UniProtKB/Swiss-Prot annotation, chain A:
Record's subunit section: Component of the large ribosomal subunit (LSU). Mature yeast ribosomes consist of a small (40S) and a large (60S) subunit. The 40S small subunit contains 1 molecule of ribosomal RNA (18S rRNA) and at least 33 different proteins. The large 60S subunit contains 3 rRNA molecules (25S, 5.8S and 5S rRNA) and at least 46 different proteins.
The organism of origin for this protein: Schizosaccharomyces pombe (strain 972 / ATCC 24843) (Fission yeast)
Gene Ontology BP, a term: cytoplasmic translation
Parent-protein start and end of this portion: 21 to 136 of 208
Subcellular location: Cytoplasm
Protein name as annotated: Large ribosomal subunit protein eL13
Signal peptide feature range: none
Cell division found in the keyword field: no
Source species, domain of life: Eukaryota
Presence of keyword Phosphoprotein: yes
One function term, GO molecular function aspect: RNA binding
Gene: rpl13
From Swiss-Prot, chain C:
Protein name: Large ribosomal subunit protein uL4B
Assembly and binders: Component of the large ribosomal subunit (LSU). Mature yeast ribosomes consist of a small (40S) and a large (60S) subunit. The 40S small subunit contains 1 molecule of ribosomal RNA (18S rRNA) and at least 33 different proteins. The large 60S subunit contains 3 rRNA molecules (25S, 5.8S and 5S rRNA) and at least 46 different proteins. uL4 is associated with the polypeptide exit tunnel. uL4 interacts with its chaperone ACL4 and the nuclear import receptor KAP104.
Family: Belongs to the universal ribosomal protein uL4 family.
Additional free-text comment from the UniProt record: There are 2 genes for uL4 in S.pombe.
Organism of origin: Schizosaccharomyces pombe (strain 972 / ATCC 24843) (Fission yeast)
Superkingdom: Eukaryota
Swiss-Prot record, chain D:
Domain of life: Eukaryota
Any GO BP annotation: rRNA processing
Main localization category: nucleus
Subcellular location: Nucleus, Nucleolus
Organism this protein belongs to: Schizosaccharomyces pombe (strain 972 / ATCC 24843) (Fission yeast)
Function, in words: Involved in the biogenesis of the 60S ribosomal subunit.
Keyword rRNA processing (UniProt): yes
Sorted UniProt keywords: Nucleus, Ribonucleoprotein, Ribosome biogenesis, rRNA processing
Name the UniProt record assigns to this protein: Nucleolar protein 16
Region (Disordered): 1-23
A Pfam short name: Nop16
From Swiss-Prot, chain E:
Compositionally biased residues, Basic residues: 142-152
GO biological process: cytoplasmic translation
Gene: rpl15
UniProt source species: Schizosaccharomyces pombe (strain 972 / ATCC 24843)
Protein task: Component of the ribosome, a large ribonucleoprotein complex responsible for the synthesis of proteins in the cell. The small ribosomal subunit (SSU) binds messenger RNAs (mRNAs) and translates the encoded message by selecting cognate aminoacyl-transfer RNA (tRNA) molecules. The large subunit (LSU) contains the ribosomal catalytic site termed the peptidyl transferase center (PTC), which catalyzes the formation of peptide bonds, thereby polymerizing the amino acids delivered by tRNAs into a polypeptide chain.
Protein's name according to its UniProt entry: Large ribosomal subunit protein eL15A
RNA sequence: UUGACCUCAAAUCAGGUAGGACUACGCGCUGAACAAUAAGCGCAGGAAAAGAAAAUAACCAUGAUUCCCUCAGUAACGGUGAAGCGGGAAAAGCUCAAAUUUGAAAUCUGGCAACAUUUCUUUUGUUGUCCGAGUUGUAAUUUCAA
RNA sequence: AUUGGAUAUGCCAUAUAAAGCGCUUUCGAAGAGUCGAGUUGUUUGCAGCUCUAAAUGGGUGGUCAUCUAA
RNA sequence: AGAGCAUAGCUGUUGGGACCCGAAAGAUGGUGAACCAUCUAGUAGCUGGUUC
RNA sequence: CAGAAGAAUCAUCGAAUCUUUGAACGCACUGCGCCUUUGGGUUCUACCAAAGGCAUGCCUGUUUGAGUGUCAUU
């Protein structure tokens, strides 16, 4: 079998139309969730900083965001990752704190019974 | 502004953090109730034919043959050593009671 | 005939920028415009720039 | 060529033609009305987010960005408090203005007491005063529901207002 | 609870109590059909942890297979064919002897309203779960085809991928 | 004895459901010749499968799955031939078993009677009542990240 | 004409309720004819057969790290 | 006191059906020793041919 | 060709209809039936015709009856 790439420009267009389709549904919030900053796990790459999967629970507790609130305002949680050093904790705590500064959370209507 | 700069570096300074113990790492720890349940069941269920034979050899002080039979049945040494210790205490508790 | 014949061909991006630069330069020569079949014999000037 | 496709070629029946091919047209915006009004339909979502002053991605972009015109320490990270951010556009100000005003409208968080709740807390207060909540919770006769001091404190607070 | 005692008693399978019950019930099961309905599971601890609830729409079936492919996989498939209107949830080992291995298969009725209104077993109603045991989607079926995570467990290497610009 | 329970059957009893076809892609089982090969058999969907670590690593550590690029025609093996990292597309997490609701099976199907509702007089529910299921365990609560 | 997610607003709301966070002189259950051992076949995985477990235990890695299967 | 890297073309070479036509098949599955379908474009050092 | 004057050998299409078979289902595979209901008819108890039905496995329930069952049972 020989795989051909004639749909390469048609996949590019289809993926872009999905981003536009996604943005139409969720109008003002970002098309991606904020990702942490981590360091790759080798002696070849540990100097580089890249994006992680989600923020650790210890990073969210320091930033002031609970693990149940976090998912609702676009902050992924990684229950697996941990902070073995204070630099990873502070690098990503500041990342969450900056995110909260630039964030507008629209209020939600709440059911409110008469008494009690 | 929210933005991640990928590549280069962020800082070579290091400060090791002490991490707590995760709940999954607690697995295998014996419970006060599980130890009670097993003691009740072990007496109620009885003993396997190979455990009866192994118990006979320990009663006759033929521990060399007992350990060999347990390993031949169970498969490894540390499984045989654990079974012999478990059955030896059963004999000791039986002797104290009877 | 097979569909996986090489249909597209790569060019270094710097050669492509060279060719487009050389083709823009050629469009400022009235003689090259005439020799390519353009009826520019009454055009006031080359390059021909108009108001915004 | 297929027997099924040849069958409808040999028939007199028309095809179930559906004219849906519309490329280069982008999805129309719903959800937020403020974004919909200020959203142009020709520009991309990156161009519209930037024009409206929002961020499409809180991370890096995995490619180039268009250039249309030539350009002319844990204490201070944990105890710090970032001073929010200014609104670069009138749309972002419009979004921010709506959020604060609506939150102010929906701010009545304190709750009143029902007939049972009021009579419950009132009877406890008449015997143990208003400051001793620990002995209030330990009275089995009047505190039948066995509410602790913190629940009884919140009952009294809601009764005050 | 009593499922702690039941599940620790199920580890001593050749003890006096378990051996007598293994041989008594193995004779009883041989007098019955090859595949017969079970009024209640013979291992209420093991069925309970495999997804069984004592409610309408949950069915337990016993089946004996000859010893000497996976024995548990064939029990799931044979019972699934016998009860074609049910979905095979899971299965387990109940008994064995010198000739037969006895298994109990948990099936779920995708048409009963007590199943279709229960969000925790609502997933089995979808058509993508038609004959899960037939496509190796059960617990033993997944294990049979070496599905798992780790180094302990084709088409994308026998093909030439020719790009547009190459 | 009456009578409960467990069985074992019966009914042209009520309500359901399975078969066959397609099979490009998909998931199982089976299998020669010149290789999970064609065939043969079994089973799905609009995708399927996989999937929230009994996973990598040995680092300043990573973090479900899937696909693409790279690693790499490399290690290893005996010409076959990966994977970790790395770069992208997409991102979403969760549910049970194992706890005494024990100051109250708090749970559920069905019959019947009303009241609604509809892609729809064709659909889908609500409320009430009775019966059944269920204590050999149905709800709430908990899933190790706790 | 049929619909979807929002907005605004009227009515109803079984809240004596239900949650997140915080703190501890109190507790914290974790899946077995499986894991594993021997051996025989299919293509390490899987399968049969004989045997058959444990509780800081068990798995996979380099005393340590990581994971938490059935 | 580094000359490489990329693309295009030419030529040679090694794989794929591999210049074309050529050698009994064998295997799988069917139909009534035979017949049929596919694997198959199976295997060729050899035969014939190979265009201004 | 012919044919109708909301015509059309039209389009759309939400309502009706859709012969015998075929997974094909009363048994068979031409025929032979079973039960029930309805009706005929100048031949009325019946007969006849037609209609309604009548496959199997399995799930939930309903009803009924057996048991060599467990008891209950002064």
């Amino acid at each position: 079998y020989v795989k051909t790439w004639f749909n390469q420009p048609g996949r590019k267009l289809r993926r872009r139309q999905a981003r536009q389709t996604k943005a139409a549904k969720i109008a003002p919030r970002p098309v991606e969730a904020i990702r942490p900053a981590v360091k790759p796990p080798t002696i070849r790459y540990n100097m580089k900083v890249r994006a992680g999967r989600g923020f650790t629970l210890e990073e969210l507790k320091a930033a002031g965001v609970s693990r149940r609130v976090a998912s609702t305002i676009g902050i992924p949680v990684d229950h697996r990752r941990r902070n073995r050093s204070e630099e990873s904790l502070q690098r990503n705590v500041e990342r969450i704190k900056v995110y909260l500064a630039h964030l507008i959370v629209f209020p939600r209507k709440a059911g409110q019974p008469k008494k009690g | 502004a929210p933005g991640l700069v990928v590549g280069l570096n962020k800082g070579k300074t290091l400060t090791k953090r002490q991490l707590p113990e995760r709940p999954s790492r607690r697995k295998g720890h014996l419970s006060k109730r599980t130890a009670f349940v097993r003691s009740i069941v072990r007496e109620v269920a009885g003993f396997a034919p190979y455990e009866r034979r192994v118990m006979e050899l320990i009663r006759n002080s033929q521990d060399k043959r007992a350990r060999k039979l347990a390993k031949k049945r169970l498969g490894t040494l540390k499984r045989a050593k654990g079974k012999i210790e478990e059955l030896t205490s059963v004999i000791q508790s039986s002797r104290l009671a009877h | 005939t097979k569909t996986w014949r090489k249909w597209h061909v790569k060019v270094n991006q710097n050669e492509k920028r060279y060719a487009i630069a050389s083709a823009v330069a050629a469009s400022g020569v009235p003689s090259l415009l005439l020799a390519r079949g353009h009826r520019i014999e009454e055009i006031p000037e080359v390059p021909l720039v108009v108001d915004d | 060529a297929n027997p099924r496709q040849r069958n409808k070629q040999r028939s007199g029946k028309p095809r179930l033609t559906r004219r849906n091919a519309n490329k280069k047209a982008k999805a129309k915006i719903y959800g937020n009305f403020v974004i919909q009004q200020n959203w142009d339909k020709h520009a991309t979502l990156r161009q519209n987010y930037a024009r409206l002053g929002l961020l499409a991605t809180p991370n890096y972009v995995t490619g180039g960005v268009e250039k249309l015109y030539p350009d002319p320490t844990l204490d201070d990270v944990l105890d710090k408090e970032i001073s929010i951010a200014p609104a670069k556009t009138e749309v972002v100000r419009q979004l921010e203005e709506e959020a604060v005003k609506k939150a102010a409208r929906q701010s009545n968080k304190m709750l009143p007491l029902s007939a049972f709740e009021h009579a419950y807390i009132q009877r406890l207060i008449n015997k143990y005063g208003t400051e001793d909540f620990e002995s209030m919770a330990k009275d089995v006769k009047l505190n039948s529901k066995l509410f602790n001091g913190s629940k009884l404190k919140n009952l009294y607070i809601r009764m005050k207002a | 609870g009593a499922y702690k005692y039941l599940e620790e008693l199920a580890k001593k399978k050749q003890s006096d109590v378990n051996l007598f019950l293994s041989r008594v019930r193995a004779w009883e099961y041989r007098q019955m059909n090859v595949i017969h309905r079970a009024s209640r599971p013979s291992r209420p601890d093991k069925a309970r942890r495999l997804g069984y609830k004592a409610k309408q729409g949950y069915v337990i079936y016993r089946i004996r297979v000859r010893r000497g492919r996976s024995a548990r996989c064939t029990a799931e498939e044979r019972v699934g064919r016998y009860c074609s209107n049910l979905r095979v949830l899971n299965s387990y080992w109940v008994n064995q002897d010198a000739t037969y291995k006895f298994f109990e298969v948990i099936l779920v009725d995708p048409s009963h309203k007590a199943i279709r209104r229960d969000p925790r077993i609502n997933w089995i109603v979808n058509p993508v779960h038609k004959h899960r045991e037939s496509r190796g989607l059960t617990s033993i079926g997944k294990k049979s085809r070496g599905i798992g995570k780790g180094h302990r467990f084709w088409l994308r290497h026998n093909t030439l991928s020719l790009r547009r610009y190459r």
